[PDB]
Design an enzyme around this catalytic site. Structure first.
Site, PDB file in Angstrom:
ATOM      1  N   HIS A   1      37.375  18.118   6.725  1.00  0.00           N
ATOM      2  CA  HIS A   1      38.467  18.284   5.788  1.00  0.00           C
ATOM      3  C   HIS A   1      39.334  17.038   5.753  1.00  0.00           C
ATOM      4  CE1 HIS A   1      40.093  18.930   9.663  1.00  0.00           C
ATOM      5  NE2 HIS A   1      41.319  18.877   9.182  1.00  0.00           N
TER       6      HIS A   1
ATOM      7  N   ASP B   1      43.864  16.487   5.275  1.00  0.00           N
ATOM      8  CA  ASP B   1      44.978  17.335   5.720  1.00  0.00           C
ATOM      9  C   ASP B   1      45.697  17.990   4.569  1.00  0.00           C
ATOM     10  OD1 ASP B   1      44.495  16.654   8.492  1.00  0.00           O
ATOM     11  OD2 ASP B   1      46.596  16.214   8.786  1.00  0.00           O
TER      12      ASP B   1
ATOM     13  N   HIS C   1      37.844  13.882   7.732  1.00  0.00           N
ATOM     14  CA  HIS C   1      37.544  13.672   9.138  1.00  0.00           C
ATOM     15  C   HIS C   1      37.074  14.950   9.748  1.00  0.00           C
ATOM     16  CE1 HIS C   1      41.717  15.121   9.125  1.00  0.00           C
ATOM     17  NE2 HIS C   1      41.449  15.632  10.309  1.00  0.00           N
TER      18      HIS C   1
ATOM     19  N   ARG D   1      51.257  12.519  16.805  1.00  0.00           N
ATOM     20  CA  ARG D   1      50.878  12.378  15.435  1.00  0.00           C
ATOM     21  C   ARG D   1      52.117  12.379  14.537  1.00  0.00           C
ATOM     22  NH1 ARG D   1      47.473  15.423  11.106  1.00  0.00           N
ATOM     23  NH2 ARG D   1      49.405  15.806   9.908  1.00  0.00           N
TER      24      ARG D   1
END
Lengths: 266, 265, 263, 264
Positions: B92, B94, B240, B255
């Protein structure tokens, strides 16, 4: 709408009609023929029970729909080269590997077993009309490559002049406008359609597979249960059929003429 | 394509680059940043090994790519709401269920096991560019309906909040990158539900083909994480796949999420 | 067949049965022929009948117990008689004990449209290779109504807990009267193979759904007012064609019990 | 591991092995550790080697017999050493009754990037199927043949042909002849159908198995360097040589080690 000269019993709500009150030994007045043809164009596959016709009469009747022509690739009767024989599967329509496939076929049931050997038909008009407007806009412009390679070309040869004609490709639109009615139908079949033009096989497969399945949904189909004496005509452009093999061993004899057509056009 | 201020080692012939000769504790002069950004736009996923940065520095670096914003549906670090955590799958990118999904994400590896936990990436530019001209002309105009219904909506609920999980948005099937101007395929298996105006049964063949095509190994790279790697991926032109394989080993990354505009054709 | 006339519909399944008035009760030798025909042809119909709700019931009771199915409409004063006013399936396989059979009476029909298809799951099974048969022989399948009226159906925007309730049936069942193995799988209620994941089950189930509905294993009944029709609920599936939209169609229906499907 | 340094590549398969010079012959205890590592990690490589064709051969011979494979190029003066110069997941030559047990590949010339090779663990592929799915396919055999690569099917996309069409049969699940571990044995290039089934029957099952076995979580990726000597188990892995270099010159040599017919 009303039919004054013939009796038209639709077989399903989507396609197919029985037609009575006609003797195909007799030639047909203009107004009667027009009603037959009107019925052919609406119902797409029609049959006339209880006929008792000769090879010449068969031919003659077929000729009212268009030119008829001996089709090589089939046996063909003694003294009557235009009449092919059928005796002793997948959804398709006839010979779409040609630039100009047949427009129609008229089949005569001579000998039948008491049951078994039904033939299915679908409406490719209804197939097309039941796709969403977005799906139609998406595939409207596509052409499809047809060839006989799986039936009698090199792929068939794999198995475990004759070959080159089997491998020869032609291109037809994915959606065709009927040359008489002006109605759009889906023009795709699982036996002859190889890929979408300009795409790879892997790209084509999802879409073609969807279209094969969609077009043969039971709700778009009818089933003809053959009787000795049935004369049956199918549109070769706007239908597909499936001759059910089930009889195994029972003797079945039909004759058949093939009426010619023009290049399928968008 | 020479780089005078940084060292750029491509990871594969298609995407990904290691970037060295930079200390992300230091703020960056205009010509150096421009080279980083040049590399980001060509290679699409970039990483900088051996960094030793704080949460403020992380944030600051992320802000050179675009606005950064706390992502709710988050863990989020104590005292630093913009920095989300990752600790202890399908291809997918994000949050495509948003009207405006993130533009990018910058991930910092704090604790790693000696092996395991690789992350895969593909180039959706290359995915699109490898379709035939006929296939491109055919899907060019299509939009796709995205939603989180399989992740935290009613479909997820069926496997034994909801309205935000079921909420649909619409994005083009092919998007033009807002900086590079390059067309890439914009479709993913987690959020994409159907093609707009088609039924599920109509959409399935085409979407399935596109999911498979876009993840061909030849369009992918694989990043093998090391403590100190700072990594940035484009959220528009890549997908990714964080490999679960480590089972039981402790892994800690932080992140940040950088914001983007509505995807446009 | 001395007491009845049996016209097979296809080479594979289905028969028209004439020379019987279902208002009259049936002697032993006549009933035996009906039942013999039911077991060979699997779906049978009797045209031209004019029966009441009591007679319908009574005829149905010769095949097995009949029982109100409380999930369906049911006629005023006759709780056993359900009224009827798509995908290939057989009835209610989410129960531990689905019906053995159903007897349907056509009361009002349009002149055309509304045909019902049937396949033989015996023939479906018999046309698999010996290797494929040996491979799936031992498998069970999880059935549930979750797509029809459970939580999955509810998605898309007690009833629900009965819709979600799972039962398990063999993939291949031996008919309790004929002793013939048939395939027992349908696309509406079968969710996965027991002990496998959905992703594991999908290829196999999909193949089996498609194989079992090949036109060559099917027949098509074109309904007429007065047809009384009986189908085996174990060894067939059916597909009521929707092609009539707006045309009024009225049939009644009784449900006959049977035993849990067994290998 | 006292005599060698073993760095696993992933949690599932692959290891880098250093602290060995493959020009030197290997004592018993060192070889045993290499072999121990080969059997656990399934694909192993040794960076920085500088070996000759004879040394390559010799090292390969510690794993099993090595034998010239005809229908590959083969080096001048060294018939055992095949060359690889200038895709789908598979393992090598499963159309034989007795496919290779392993292959040892030597990277001689590489481009700076591009040309990675993927590997999966078919042990892990098998171990991640449910017990019911395992019981279901355990007994099945699969028909393998080279017909799509160089037989009549390949010929259709316009002696070579009869060897290309020749079929052999292997189990669907094989027990490794050294480790005793069950792995999945199926590949998309050579597997044609399940034995005794039709193609249409076989397709759902095979397709599922192809996809399952190549999930990223069962894979590793080797990024080649000049001097890498790499050994893969040909029974319990599949690989995928990534084409991503077009026009960059790539030269590797390769020996093929024999093994036994795949058994249940």
């Amino acid at each position: 709408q009303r039919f004054e000269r013939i009796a038209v019993q639709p077989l399903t709500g989507v396609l197919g009609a029985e037609i009575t009150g006609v003797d195909l030994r007799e030639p047909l007045d203009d107004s009667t023929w027009n009603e037959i043809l009107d019925a052919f164009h609406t119902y797409q596959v029609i049959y006339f029970p209880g006929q008792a016709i000769t090879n010449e009469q068969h031919i003659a009747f077929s000729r009212r729909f268009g030119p008829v022509d001996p089709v090589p690739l089939l046996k063909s009767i003694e003294g009557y080269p235009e009449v092919q024989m059928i005796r002793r599967e997948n959804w398709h329509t006839d010979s779409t590997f040609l630039d100009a496939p047949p427009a129609a076929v008229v089949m005569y049931a001579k000998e039948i077993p008491p049951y078994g050997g039904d033939t299915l038909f679908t409406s490719m008009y209804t197939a097309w009309e039941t796709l969403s407007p977005t799906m139609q806009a998406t595939i409207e412009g596509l052409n499809v490559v047809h060839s006989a390679t799986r039936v009698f070309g090199s792929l068939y040869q794999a198995q475990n002049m004759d070959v080159d004609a089997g491998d020869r490709e032609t291109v037809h639109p994915l959606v065709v406008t009927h040359p008489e009615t002006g109605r759009k139908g889906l023009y795709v079949n699982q036996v002859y359609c190889q890929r979408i033009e300009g795409m790879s096989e892997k790209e084509s497969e999802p879409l073609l597979s969807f279209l094969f399945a969609h077009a043969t949904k039971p709700e778009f189909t009818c089933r003809v249960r053959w009787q000795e004496g049935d004369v049956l005509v199918w549109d070769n452009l706007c239908t597909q059929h499936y001759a059910v093999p089930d009889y195994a061993g029972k003797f079945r004899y039909l004759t058949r003429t093939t009426v010619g057509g023009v290049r399928p056009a968008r």
